[PDB]
Amino acid sequence: SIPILKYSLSTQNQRVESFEVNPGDEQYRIYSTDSLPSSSEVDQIIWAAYRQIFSEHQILKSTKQPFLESQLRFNQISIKDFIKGLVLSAPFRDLNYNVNNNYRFVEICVQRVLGRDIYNEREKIAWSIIIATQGLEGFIDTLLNTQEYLSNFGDSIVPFQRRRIIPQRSKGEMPFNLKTPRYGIEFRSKLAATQFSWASPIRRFRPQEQQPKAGDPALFLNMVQEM
């Protein structure tokens, strides 16, 4: 009954291994409910779930889920049922689902939930019909039953961005909250009449004759300060 469009993979960091036994400093901190946390250390998991599935913004008083928080602390539901309550939360609909289309919302729910980037643009095409046929509640449980969710998160780990940085290096890739914001350039530009009409304030006035031209040694002073 209409299987998914057979897309193709690509080259990424999460589908190879690291050879990192005893990983040093850039570990992304496995908060889990098999380490048996105290009641002040359940609270450091619930903040990490809110920071992963929302951004750091929407951890407001109105966007908290105080009945879903209590059922985690009674060990009634798991972490996998707690992430599913956060995408089906009514703050996640009106802030992150009404302001972008179905092909950008798949880029949110694979970067935050699976912790990997999208493979190519056909995977956003291949996944966006699941939201329009059986709904968002039918979209999350077919995304939380994938083998990429179970083989490194399972039923007890709040997800994270897997292999963001290369171990000898210090730059790496971009964090996913700074990769895909709440809305993009294509939703912002079409609404410039009703919403998003701001016009911009004045910049600091730089005079025009102080700007560097080709063959000026002031275009290399940022190179010299990195020496």
Ligand X SMILES: CCC1=C(C)/C(=C/C2=NC(=C\c3[nH]c(/C=C4\NC(=O)[C@H](C)[C@H]4CC)c(C)c3CCC(=O)O)/C(CCC(=O)O)=C2C)NC1=O
User: Rule CB under 6 A: which residues touch ligand X?
Assistant: 5, 11, 13, 15-16, 55-57, 102, 125-126, 128-129, 132, 166, 168, 175, 177-178, 181-182, 217
Q: Which two tokens stand for residue 193?
A: 């009449």
Nearer to ligand X, 64 or 182 (CB): 182
Nearer to ligand X, 38 or 206 (CB): 206
Let me know how many helices (H) and strands (E) the chain has, helices first: 11, 0
Using alpha carbons only, what angle is made at residue 9 by residues 4 and 14, rounded to the nearest 5 degrees? 120
Q: Which does 211 bind (CB under 5 to 8 A by kind): ligand X, another protein, none?
A: another protein
Site residues (CB under 8 A) for another protein, limited to 181-210:
181-188, 192-209
> What are 157's strand-pairing partners?
32
Cβ atoms of residues 2 and 126 within 8 Å: no
Rg (CA), the chain: 22
Q: Which two tokens stand for residue 119?
A: 């493979």
Q: Which does 40 bind (CB under 5 to 8 A by kind): ligand X, another protein, none?
A: none
Q: Which does 205 bind (CB under 5 to 8 A by kind): ligand X, another protein, none?
A: another protein
Query: For another protein, which stretch binds (CB under 8 A), given 10-18, 29-37, 92-100, 109-117?
Result: 92-100
- Residues 6 or more apart whose CB falls under 8 angstroms from that of 95 comprise 58, 63, 182
Q: Which does 15 bind (CB under 5 to 8 A by kind): another protein, ligand X, none?
A: ligand X
Residue of minimal CB distance from ligand X? 16
CA 49 to chain CA mean position, Å: 11
Residue with structure tokens 């006035």? 205
Nearer to ligand X, 79 or 108 (CB): 108
Q: Which does 16 bind (CB under 5 to 8 A by kind): another protein, ligand X, none?
A: ligand X
